[PDB]
């Protein structure tokens, strides 16, 4: 069975931020308009019995003083008065500024994604769900004591920590246009959480990591975590087929060698050709085959309990078009039951947002990688030697 995180308060909170507006509502309302919701188990966001218990849960990763600052920032924005000079400095010391400014529900907003992704992890753990989807989650840039790139709390790190604390290994697959730096950093010394981000990287492009660091090299973990952080940076303009061929053997190799207890997928939609980022040229096409659908179906064929999370996506109706299809694909791959998605957007509350033509398909007409494959294959060998893992080196070598 397949779970999905939602709830009336949750929706309202996920829709309160200035950057993402009502995107989460478009997503869930298109999933509902396509009659996918009777197929899905609703997973409610986690709630706590005390302030101390919520605090304990968030400070499994974030610092107490950072959580204090984020909660004070919300309070400060629930009043009319400007911030004082001392409070401006306090917020600045946590990067609670720039692309992560305050607003009246910033703490509740950030916490909501944490509640969602922790209940999604718990559902996988008690085996209630084989796969769980949280399109209100996936905020991979937040750090221990630092907000970054619209991310204030790192719900993914907290979810992954709850999975490993239940020998357990987690594979994290980050499909966002941007390097998943917060999650990579959090598990930099941990062999039990292998992280893999594919992304655009180029000079000046946010956040700047996930690429070359004497000829330059890739850092890939430290201490017992050495070789446990994987990265594949790609050039702008890549299409579905080339991106699919680029990540396919890496994904298959990671599964064979690591044999994960769980997979966590960040499924940011800003690689889409129609995203205002306009960097990659992926689609939501399902006959070109969507790079996203290819990767998700491949991960699901492994039959490992899987958390599927949102992330970037700044063309809100096209993010909804993609994630609706990811959601139908998951139901199909898990229940064994075919889903039939009409190519035309069904009438519903946000139907006008899908003009001028109202189709499910997005409105688009479509050797470095080989060196990267040899580097990654060797890193996987090193990881597997360091961590005393058995594996047929010629079974993995033929995947490429």
Ligand X SMILES: O=C(NO)c1cccc(-c2cn(CSc3ccccc3)nn2)c1
Contact 5, 133 (CB under 8 A): yes
Q: Would you mind telling me the total number of residues written for the chain in this entry?
A: 400
Binding-site annotation: residue ranges for Zn(2+) = 176, 178, 270
* Min separation Cβ 1 and Zn ion, Å: 30
CB 149, min distance to ligand X, A: 3
Q: Which entry of ligand X, K ion, Zn ion, none binds 197, CB below 5 to 8 A by partner kind?
A: K ion
Site for ligand X in 201-230 (CB under 6 A): 206
Q: Which does 274 bind (CB under 5 to 8 A by kind): ligand X, Zn ion, K ion, none?
A: none
Give the interface size with ligand X as a residue count (CB under 6 A): 15
CA angle 365, 288, 31 (to 5 degrees): 90
Identify the helix (H) or strand (E) that includes residue 2: strand 2-5
Q: Which does 40 bind (CB under 5 to 8 A by kind): K ion, Zn ion, ligand X, none?
A: none
3-state SS assignment for residue 325: helix
**Applying CB under 6 A, which part among 82-90, 113-121, 186-194, 269-277 lies near ligand X?**
269-277
Q: Examine residue 103 and tell whether it contacts ligand X (CB under 6 A).
A: no
The three-state secondary structure class of 197 is: strand
Tokens (6 digits) for 118: 């922790």
281 binds, among K ion, ligand X, Zn ion, none (CB under 5 to 8 A by kind): none
Interface residue with ligand X, options 65, 276, 352, 378 (CB under 6 A): 276
Q: Would you tell me which residues interact with Zn ion (CB under 5 A)? A: 176-178, 268, 270, 312
On whether the CB atoms of residues 137 and 30 are closer than 8 A, the answer is no
Q: Residue 174 or residue 333: which is nearer to K ion going by CB?
A: 174
CB of 270 to Zn ion, least distance (A): 4
Torsion angle in degrees (nearest 10) through CA of 116, 122, 124, 125: 160
Q: Is the peptide bond before 134 cis (omega within 30 degrees of 0)?
A: no
Piece of 110-118, 127-135, 223-231, 330-338 that binds K ion (CB under 5 A): 223-231
Bond preceding residue 207 cis, omega within 30 of 0: yes
What x-and-dash track marks residues 300-319 binding ligand X by CB under 6 A?
Answer: -----------xx-x-----
- Which residues in 141-180 contact K ion (CB under 5 A)? 174, 176, 180
Which x/- pattern over 165-184 shows residues binding ligand X (rule: CB under 6 A)? -----------x-x------
As a dihedral over the C-alpha atoms of residue 328, residue 273, residue 183, residue 18, rounded to 10 degrees, the angle is: -90
Contact call for residues 108 and 16 (beta carbons, < 8 A) = yes
The DSSP letter of residue 204 is T
Query: Is residue 141 flagged as an active site residue?
Result: yes
Pick the catalytic residue: 140, 141, 161, 373?
141
Do residues 193 and 187 make contact, with C-beta atoms less than 8 angstroms apart?
A: yes
Residue 199 as a binder of ligand X (CB under 6 A): the answer is no
Q: Mind giving me the DSSP string for 359-377?
A: BSS-S----HHHHHHHHHH
Which residue lies nearer to Zn ion by CB, 141 or 373? 141
CB proximity list for 316: less than 8 A, separation 6 or greater = 21, 22, 23, 26, 353
The span from the CA of 384 to the CA of 226, in Å, is: 11
DSSP secondary structure code for residue 44 in this structure:
P
Rg (CA), the chain: 20
Site residues, K ion (CB under 5 A): 174, 176, 180, 187, 190, 193, 197, 199, 225, 228
Known catalytic residues are: 141
Site residues, ligand X (CB under 6 A): 19, 99, 141, 149-150, 176, 178, 206, 268, 270, 276-277, 311-312, 314
């Amino acid at each position: 069975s397949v779970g999905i995180v939602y709830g009336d308060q949750y929706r309202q909170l996920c829709c309160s931020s200035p950057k993402f507006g009502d995107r989460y509502a478009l997503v869930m309302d298109l999933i509902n308009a396509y009659k996918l919701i009777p197929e899905l188990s609703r997973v409610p966001p986690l709630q706590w019995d005390s302030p101390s218990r919520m605090y304990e849960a968030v400070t499994a990763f974030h610092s107490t003083e950072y959580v204090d600052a984020l909660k004070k920032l919300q309070m400060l924005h629930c009043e009319e008065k400007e911030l004082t000079a001392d409070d401006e400095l306090l917020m600045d010391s946590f990067s609670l500024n720039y692309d992560c400014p305050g607003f009246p529900s910033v703490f509740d907003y950030s916490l909501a994604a944490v509640q969602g992704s922790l209940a999604a992890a718990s559902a996988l753990i008690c085996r209630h769900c084989e796969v769980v989807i949280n399109w209100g989650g996936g905020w991979h840039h937040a750090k221990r004591s630092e907000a970054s790139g619209f991310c204030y709390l790192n719900d993914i790190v907290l979810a992954i920590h709850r999975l490993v604390s239940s020998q357990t290994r987690v594979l994290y697959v980050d499909l966002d246009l941007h390097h998943g730096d917060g999650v990579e950093e959090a598990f930099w010394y941990s062999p039990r959480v292998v992280t893999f981000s594919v992304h655009h990287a180029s000079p000046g492009f946010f956040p700047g990591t996930g690429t070359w660091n004497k000829l330059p090299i890739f850092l890939n973990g430290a201490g017992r975590g050495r070789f446990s952080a994987f990265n594949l940076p790609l050039e702008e303009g890549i299409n579905d087929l080339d991106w699919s061929n680029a990540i396919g053997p890496i994904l298959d190799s990671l599964n064979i060698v690591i044999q994960p207890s769980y997979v966590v997928v960040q499924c940011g939609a800003d690689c889409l050709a129609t995203d205002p980022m306009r960097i990659f040229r992926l689609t939501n096409f399902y006959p070109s085959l969507s790079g996203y659908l290819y990767a998700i179906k491949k991960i699901l064929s492994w039959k490992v309990p899987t958390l599927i999370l949102g992330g970037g996506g700044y063309n809100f109706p096209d993010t909804a078009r993609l994630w609706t299809r990811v959601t139908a694909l998951t139901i199909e791959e898990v229940k064994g039951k075919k889903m039939t998605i009409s190519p035309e957007i069904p009438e519903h509350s946000y139907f006008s947002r899908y003009g001028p033509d109202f189709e499910l398909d997005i409105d688009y007409f479509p050797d470095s990688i080989q060196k990267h494959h040899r580097r990654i294959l060797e890193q996987l060998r090193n990881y597997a030697d360091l961590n005393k893992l058995i594996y047929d080196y010629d079974q993995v070598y033929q995947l490429y």
